[PDB]
Nucleic acid binder design. Structure first.
Ligand SMILES: [Mg+2]
Ligand SMILES: [Mg+2]
Ligand SMILES: [Mg+2]
Ligand SMILES: [Mg+2]
Ligand SMILES: [Mg+2]
Ligand SMILES: [Mg+2]
Ligand SMILES: [Mg+2]
Ligand SMILES: [Mg+2]
Ligand SMILES: [Mg+2]
Ligand SMILES: [Mg+2]
Ligand SMILES: [Mg+2]
Ligand SMILES: [Mg+2]
Ligand SMILES: [Mg+2]
Length: 150
RNA sequence: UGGAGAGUUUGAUCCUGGCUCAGGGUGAACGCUGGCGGCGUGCCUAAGACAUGCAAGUCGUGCGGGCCGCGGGGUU
């Protein structure tokens, strides 16, 4: 059903009289490679607990990606903080031309041919968030049609 | 029919921002190594200095000769 991908895991530290106190951050992608993708970022005392928490959170955050012959209905450029993502539609045979973060998402989203580009802050966390916002914003001829029918 | 990023400022974080790496190219050079062939290519520096040979001539159907030679004439 849903395939999970781990974007990254960081160790993060905090301070107390005595020393440092770690936590673990986990960014996890989940999708059915059939138009549904979810992002999840969970943290916990230990990695596993974190990951699991991430996965659990991903499923809580789903996006309905309007796949088309394997690509996206058009181009969007989304800015999440200092990270900017650029998604450009492509023909078949192209493949998923993207950095690891946007890829993992696009792939589990069902996207198969797409032109991508990371601009601004390359921060994986905000890039991944930038992506979901991009996809989430994709519209369709029918969608526009609906909106401008009035 | 066309576009991937990564490492590094912090105890940790986000940002800014420089440095650095992965790719492609070259009339190359250097090191270790070196079997065959085809096609290309080879002073990028002193437009510095050059031994030696060759690199622009040809025409007797424009012309008159010199030199070396043969043949035939005008005479007893
Ligand atoms: Mg770090
Ligand atoms: Mg900005
Ligand atoms: Mg990435
Ligand atoms: Mg930058
Ligand atoms: Mg500082
Ligand atoms: Mg440090
Ligand atoms: Mg501080
Ligand atoms: Mg940088
Ligand atoms: Mg040769
Ligand atoms: Mg030659
Ligand atoms: Mg020269
Ligand atoms: Mg010379
Ligand atoms: Mg000269």
């Amino acid at each position: 059903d849903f395939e999970e991908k781990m974007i990254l895991i960081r160790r993060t530290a905090r301070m107390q009289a005595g020393g440092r106190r770690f936590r673990f951050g986990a960014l996890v992608v989940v999708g059915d490679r059939q138009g549904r993708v979810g992002l999840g970022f969970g943290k916990a005392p230990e990695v596993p607990l974190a990951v699991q928490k991430a996965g659990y959170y991903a499923r809580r955050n789903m996006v309905e990606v309007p796949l088309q012959n394997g690509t996206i209905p058009h181009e969007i450029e989304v800015e999440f903080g200092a990270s900017k993502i650029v998604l450009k539609p492509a023909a078949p045979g192209t493949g998923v031309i993207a950095g690891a973060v946007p890829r993992a998402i696009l792939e589990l989203a069902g996207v198969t041919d797409i032109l991508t580009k990371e601009l601004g802050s390359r921060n994986p966390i905000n890039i991944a968030y930038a992506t979901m916002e991009a996809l989430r914003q994709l519209r369709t001829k029918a969608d526009v049609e609906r909106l401008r029918k009035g």
